[PDB]
């Protein structure tokens with residue numbers, strides 16, 4: 001378990017990774 | 026729950042997203 | 051403990067640091 | 076509580092913020 005704030009920041013970072021990849025594909 | 030250091034790093038990443046957006050609006 | 055999404059985002063950030071270092075050595 | 080990996084990534088993120096601030100002061 002995690003603070004919902006920590007989960008959201010985690011989803012930002014993962015989505016940041018996704019898009020970084022997609023912009024470079 | 027989360028360690029308070031993880032919460033603070035979370036709040037930094039969220040605020041970082043906020044400001045990144047604001048500077049681009 | 052942490053939520054696996056938080057763990058995954060963590061591994062991204064650590065791996066990001068590693069790569070940033072390696073690209074600059 | 077958090078996974079030590081989450082704590083580690085959190086410290087990276089907080090130290091990244093600090094350095095970012097210091098390089099711009």
Ligand SMILES: C[C@H](N)[C@]12C[C@H]3C[C@H](C[C@H](C3)C1)C2
Nearest residue numbers: 009010034035038059063088
């Ligand atoms: C570096 C990210 N902003 C991150 C987001 C979440 C909070 C902390 C640790 C990890 C999960 C990674 C900071």
Ligand SMILES: [Cl-]
Nearest residue numbers: 002027052077
């Ligand atoms: Cl956590």
Ligand code: NA
Nearest residue numbers: 001026051076
């Ligand atoms: Na936790």
